[PDB]
Design a binder for this molecule. Structure first.
Ligand code: SF4
Ligand SMILES: [Mg+2]
Ligand SMILES: [Mg+2]
Ligand SMILES: [Mg+2]
Ligand SMILES: [Mg+2]
Ligand SMILES: [Mg+2]
Ligand SMILES: [Mg+2]
Ligand SMILES: [Mg+2]
Ligand SMILES: [Mg+2]
Ligand SMILES: [Mg+2]
Ligand SMILES: [Mg+2]
Ligand SMILES: [Mg+2]
Ligand SMILES: [Mg+2]
Ligand SMILES: [Mg+2]
Ligand SMILES: [Mg+2]
Ligand SMILES: [Mg+2]
Ligand SMILES: [Mg+2]
Ligand SMILES: [Mg+2]
Ligand SMILES: [Mg+2]
Ligand SMILES: [Mg+2]
Ligand SMILES: [Mg+2]
Ligand SMILES: [Mg+2]
Ligand SMILES: [Mg+2]
Ligand SMILES: [Mg+2]
Ligand SMILES: [Mg+2]
Ligand SMILES: [Mg+2]
Ligand SMILES: [Mg+2]
Ligand SMILES: [Mg+2]
Ligand SMILES: [Mg+2]
Ligand SMILES: [Mg+2]
Ligand SMILES: [Mg+2]
Ligand SMILES: [Mg+2]
Ligand SMILES: [Mg+2]
Ligand SMILES: [Mg+2]
Ligand SMILES: [Mg+2]
Ligand SMILES: [Mg+2]
Ligand SMILES: [Mg+2]
Ligand SMILES: [Mg+2]
Ligand SMILES: [Mg+2]
Ligand SMILES: [Mg+2]
Ligand SMILES: [Mg+2]
Ligand SMILES: [Mg+2]
Ligand SMILES: [Mg+2]
Ligand SMILES: [Mg+2]
Ligand SMILES: [Mg+2]
Ligand SMILES: [Mg+2]
Ligand SMILES: [Mg+2]
Ligand SMILES: [Mg+2]
Ligand SMILES: [Mg+2]
Ligand SMILES: [Mg+2]
Ligand SMILES: [Mg+2]
Ligand SMILES: [Mg+2]
Ligand SMILES: [Mg+2]
Ligand SMILES: [Mg+2]
Ligand SMILES: [Mg+2]
Ligand SMILES: [Mg+2]
Ligand SMILES: [Mg+2]
Ligand SMILES: [Mg+2]
Ligand SMILES: [Mg+2]
Ligand SMILES: [Mg+2]
Ligand SMILES: [Mg+2]
Ligand SMILES: [Mg+2]
Ligand SMILES: [Mg+2]
Ligand SMILES: [Mg+2]
Ligand SMILES: [Mg+2]
Ligand SMILES: [Mg+2]
Ligand SMILES: [Mg+2]
Ligand SMILES: [Mg+2]
Ligand SMILES: [Mg+2]
Ligand SMILES: [Mg+2]
Ligand SMILES: [Mg+2]
Ligand SMILES: [Mg+2]
Ligand SMILES: [Mg+2]
Ligand SMILES: [Mg+2]
Lengths: 148, 137, 208, 231
RNA sequence: UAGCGCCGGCCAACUCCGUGCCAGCAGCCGCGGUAAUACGGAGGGCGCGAGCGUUACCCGGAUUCACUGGGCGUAAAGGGCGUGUAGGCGGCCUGGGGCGUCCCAUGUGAAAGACCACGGCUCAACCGUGGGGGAGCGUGGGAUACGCUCAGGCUAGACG
RNA sequence: CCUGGUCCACCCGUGACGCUGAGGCGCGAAAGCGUGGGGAGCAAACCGGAUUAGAUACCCGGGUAGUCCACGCCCUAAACGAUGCGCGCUAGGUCUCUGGGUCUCCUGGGGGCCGAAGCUAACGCGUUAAGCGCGCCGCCUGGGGAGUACGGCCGCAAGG
């Protein structure tokens, strides 16, 4: 099993005669703090089901981060629409320096030491997607020598 | 046409984004020196001086990864990234001490130096600097 | 100056026993042992989940309220370890420890740090000979911390060394009981000391 | 098993209604028609069947996809002959990606099987019979070959990856290998094991299906001589 | 000797009464029209501590002048269109020079301060001793790939 | 009749002569202005009739500038593809206009539609890029105040 954290829980509305009627969403990451994270987005008529629905997707889309002594191997800059995330490798006693969104994403991934920065649209849902697709594009010296 | 190198790097970048076997660039002794490094460092299979309709070109043999399982079968790239640094607009040189480390080692930076075209590594071994032509990973 | 007030309300807020008195901390008259819930009109209500910021402040006051230390001295000691080489977390703990008022207490010269202060400030302590009445002295490896001879015949320090006859004291400290003198061997690895504190989170409190 | 008189059955079709990814498997355009290098068909049969043969001896199921009226009946014979599932009529959305749910609709079928095999009451209203019977008659129409499928197939085999893009789509999302006879209107890069051939002429569908059915049964315990086909 | 700010969201800390779009609060969104955790008091609580808050100003957050590091179809943003001056920029091959560029050796880059170690005031603030540099410019020597200049060719750009 | 741009085929001539372009200079729909013509139709202003609470409008009958010509001014626009120019690279289907061929079709150059990859906040763009790149230019930096004021240059004035 994994450690699980709810990063976002929001309410949205739609309109029809008689007035507004709501729907809830939850951005949820899940991970072992040992090289495995997954991000899931769940929407439902009530908070709990959405949180649970989210968790199922989180496990449905996962990714394997090549941790090297608790930091990422190389620079990664990634855009997701108008959102940009910078992940920069950091030495031992550094700490995890990121906003509560990529913080929880990287944290549950076993990342213990990292310099980061959000640029552009800091919309919670998009910055999430950009942090993940960044990891999914992380490589190591092995991976490289094998390609080339 | 105002930049041969920038055209060259670009001719490739388009060719690799739709997985062509090769693509041809107009020939130059300077392009051979860059393709040479691009050959040795293994971003491409290699190249050869061919001729098109009476005109000298260089045919460059591209290299990719394996097919992938999933909705997107398209194999990973070998040249993920390639882009000019120094340009006719804004010349870029670096002394030895400020020579960059591309992508935490996993990539290269090509140079024009008074000792020839060298990588970030080579330049530091020989102890010389030069115009930072481009970066690749 | 220092905190100097009701101290059980402290543990009750932190959710954890901090050993801020000495004797009573062990008896069942200890406040956490009667009421493990935050002080005041609203302590028995069901809590609401604290935010990241909420969580970190709380972990900070934890480590901080242990030592009876001002935020300034805390901050400055911290912003030292931030600058100085290596891993921040250990060094902060280390430099925290090298305090005389702490050193006196870890040896069992005193029953609390609060008593370890009044011991230090009233000169009843000495470092490698010379009288020292400064709670803030950064004790260095090789230092021998002892009681003044001129006060060695005092009820409190004699009685308080009585417990120490063969009592354990952390690896980096040695103690000639009866003789009233102890020794600082080295500043701790995070392992040596088990303060009920996640120390990484304090860095992150300050990264904000 | 392989054979060479395939050119006595298909070599390909469809003019400039082509897909440019398929050019690597096309010999030339003559009859105002894209023509498949049949040599280039053998290569891929060799590799594709190896998969199918290696898949045979492992005792693993194969889903059979063909629903254009040119390949309608011919799949139904062949999938049964190898004892494996198919779809004849409509390819329901979520047959794979929503299996537990779609197949929850076979439990209604198996349950109708029993109920109409007497008695479990016939004192149920006349009109309910009318209703239940037709529902069985309705359900039967689509699920006769899918009911065998009781778990996600270890492969699927397709007539038109262009016409059945949906099927191909689900399989991909379920990491399932994709096998297909497919002509020049189709997308090559989309199929794992490709049989570059005409996918409309009944001739071509007979050759490639049956011989693949035979390769399946050969390595799955036994052999047999010829199978039903209209001239 | 213990004081001061805060407890609607940001943002750490909540209840009762009094008030009734009044009195008042306010950095922003916003609070107050008879059950206000947002106003006034109290209890309780949170944060610092011989201090705590406020006003003003500087950098940060502001990749919101974007060299690092932004943009212009519809959000702010292509000149109404040409023609052309200065300027910026420029194809393939070979040699001379070595201007830009890279390297080496040397001079200068004061002291205090910054940093690393140590040591002196019981510590610290403060202060002492030593250590490590840098750009940048002067000089000498070297390098010649790219950009420069000069010279000699070519025909893929351009013109006829 | 006088005159410009532009495409094609031959691959004959020159040998990088190229690209862009702050200022400058020219061109620049309508309306508008000056002097002189011209004035059939139309028609701001204006008159009358209807409608209407009112009708300084929409509808109907009249009607002057002007609309036309020459010369000289004005220089604005939803002057639009709301998309600066040039070059190179990155699937195809189809419709059309116009050269040339070995006239199924192949090749150039323009005009539309749908679409690969990719781009995009989305809408949509997509070899006529809004894609991947280089060069140079113009332009944007919250709404209003305001295209206003002041200064300056231009114009007969309007006004730019
Ligand atoms: S008694 Fe329990 S609560 Fe009161 S101080 Fe000692 S430990 Fe903390
Ligand atoms: Mg990996
Ligand atoms: Mg963007
Ligand atoms: Mg975004
Ligand atoms: Mg590293
Ligand atoms: Mg923004
Ligand atoms: Mg925001
Ligand atoms: Mg740069
Ligand atoms: Mg303790
Ligand atoms: Mg946390
Ligand atoms: Mg450090
Ligand atoms: Mg302890
Ligand atoms: Mg900071
Ligand atoms: Mg077909
Ligand atoms: Mg405050
Ligand atoms: Mg605060
Ligand atoms: Mg709170
Ligand atoms: Mg009143
Ligand atoms: Mg009230
Ligand atoms: Mg307030
Ligand atoms: Mg109040
Ligand atoms: Mg003080
Ligand atoms: Mg002050
Ligand atoms: Mg500011
Ligand atoms: Mg800035
Ligand atoms: Mg810039
Ligand atoms: Mg911007
Ligand atoms: Mg324009
Ligand atoms: Mg103009
Ligand atoms: Mg021009
Ligand atoms: Mg010029
Ligand atoms: Mg020049
Ligand atoms: Mg040149
Ligand atoms: Mg030269
Ligand atoms: Mg020089
Ligand atoms: Mg120097
Ligand atoms: Mg100095
Ligand atoms: Mg000292
Ligand atoms: Mg420095
Ligand atoms: Mg030379
Ligand atoms: Mg010359
Ligand atoms: Mg030519
Ligand atoms: Mg010629
Ligand atoms: Mg101009
Ligand atoms: Mg005009
Ligand atoms: Mg006019
Ligand atoms: Mg007038
Ligand atoms: Mg006139
Ligand atoms: Mg007149
Ligand atoms: Mg009237
Ligand atoms: Mg009237
Ligand atoms: Mg009227
Ligand atoms: Mg009229
Ligand atoms: Mg007039
Ligand atoms: Mg007029
Ligand atoms: Mg138009
Ligand atoms: Mg146009
Ligand atoms: Mg405009
Ligand atoms: Mg606009
Ligand atoms: Mg322009
Ligand atoms: Mg532009
Ligand atoms: Mg034609
Ligand atoms: Mg013709
Ligand atoms: Mg065309
Ligand atoms: Mg037209
Ligand atoms: Mg389109
Ligand atoms: Mg697409
Ligand atoms: Mg086209
Ligand atoms: Mg755009
Ligand atoms: Mg303003
Ligand atoms: Mg404004
Ligand atoms: Mg004006
Ligand atoms: Mg105007
Ligand atoms: Mg004026």
């Amino acid at each position: 099993d994994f450690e699980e954290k709810m990063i976002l829980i929001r309410r949205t509305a739609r309109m029809q005669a008689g007035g507004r009627r709501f729907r809830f969403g939850a951005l949820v990451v899940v991970g072992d703090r040992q090289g495995r994270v997954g991000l899931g987005f769940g929407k439902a008529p009530e908070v709990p089901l959405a949180v649970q629905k989210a968790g199922y997707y989180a496990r449905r889309n996962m990714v394997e981060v090549p941790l090297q002594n608790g930091t990422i191997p190389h620079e990664i800059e990634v855009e997701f629409g108008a959102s940009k995330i910078v992940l920069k490798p950091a030495a031992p006693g550094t700490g995890v320096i990121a906003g509560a969104v990529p913080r929880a994403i990287l944290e549950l991934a076993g990342v213990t030491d990292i310099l980061t920065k959000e640029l552009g649209s800091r919309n919670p849902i998009n910055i999430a997607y950009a942090t993940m697709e960044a990891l999914r594009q992380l490589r190591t010296k092995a991976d490289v020598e094998r390609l080339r | 046409l105002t930049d041969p190198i920038a055209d060259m790097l670009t001719r490739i970048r388009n060719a690799t984004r739709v997985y062509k076997e090769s693509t041809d660039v107009p020939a130059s002794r300077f392009k051979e020196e860059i393709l040479r490094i691009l050959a040795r460092e293994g971003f491409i299979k290699g190249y050869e001086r061919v001729d098109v309709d009476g005109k000298p070109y260089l045919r460059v043999y591209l290299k990719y990864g394996p097919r992938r399982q999933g909705p997107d079968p398209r194999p990973e790239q070998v040249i993920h990234h390639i882009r000019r640094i120094s340009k006719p607009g804004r010349r870029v040189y670096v002394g030895v001490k400020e020579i960059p480390r591309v992508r935490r080692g996993l990539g290269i930076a090509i140079l024009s130096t008074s000792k020839g075209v060298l990588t970030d590594r080579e330049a530091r071994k020989l102890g010389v600097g030069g115009e930072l032509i481009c970066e690749v990973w | 100056g220092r905190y100097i007030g009701p101290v059980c309300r402290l543990c009750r807020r932190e959710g954890v026993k901090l050993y801020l008195k000495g004797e009573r901390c062990y008896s069942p008259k200890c406040a956490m042992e009667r009421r493990p819930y935050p002080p005041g009109q609203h302590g028995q209500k069901r809590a609401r989940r604290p935010s990241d910021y909420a969580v970190r402040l709380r972990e900070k006051q934890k480590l901080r309220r242990i030592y009876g230390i001002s935020e300034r001295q805390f901050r400055n000691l911290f912003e030292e370890a931030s600058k100085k080489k290596g891993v921040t977390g250990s060094v902060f703990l280390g430099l925290l420890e090298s305090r005389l008022d702490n050193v006196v207490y870890r040896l069992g010269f005193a029953v609390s740090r609060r008593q370890a202060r009044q011991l230090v400030r009233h000169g009843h302590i000495t470092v490698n000979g010379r009288r020292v009445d400064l709670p803030s002295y950064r004790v260095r490896p090789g230092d021998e911390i002892a009681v003044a001879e001129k006060s060695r015949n005092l009820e409190l320090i004699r009685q308080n060394l009585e417990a120490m006859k063969g009592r354990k004291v952390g690896p980096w400290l040695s103690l000639d009981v009866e003789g009233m003198k102890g020794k600082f061997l080295r500043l701790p690895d995070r392992e040596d000391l088990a303060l009920p504190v996640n120390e990484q989170l304090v860095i992150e409190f300050y990264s904000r | 098993v392989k054979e060479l008189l395939e050119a006595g059955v298909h070599f390909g079709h469809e003019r400039k209604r082509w897909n440019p990814k398929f050019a690597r498997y096309i010999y030339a355009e003559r009859n105002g028609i894209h023509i498949i290098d049949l040599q280039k068909t053998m290569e891929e049969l060799e590799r594709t069947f190896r998969f199918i043969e290696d898949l045979a001896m492992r005792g693993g199921t194969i889903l059979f996809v063909g629903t254009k009226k040119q390949a309608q009946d011919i799949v139904r014979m062949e999938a049964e002959r190898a004892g494996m599932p198919y779809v004849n009529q409509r390819w329901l959305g979520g047959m794979l990606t929503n299996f537990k749910t779609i197949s929850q609709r076979v439990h209604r079928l198996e349950e109708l099987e029993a109920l109409f095999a007497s008695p479990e009451i016939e004192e149920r209203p006349k009109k309910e019979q009318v209703r239940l019977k037709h529902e069985l008659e309705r359900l039967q129409k689509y699920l006769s070959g899918f009911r065998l499928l009781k778990r996600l197939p270890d492969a699927i085999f397709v007539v038109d990856p262009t016409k059945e893009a949906i099927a191909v789509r689900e399989a991909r999302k379920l990491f399932i290998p994709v096998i297909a006879l497919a002509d020049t209107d189709s997308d090559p890069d989309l199929v794992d094991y490709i049989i570059p051939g005409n996918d409309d002429a009944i001739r071509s569908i007979q050759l490639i299906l049956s011989r693949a059915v035979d390769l399946i049964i050969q390595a799955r315990g036994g052999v047999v001589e010829p199978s039903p086909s209209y001239a």
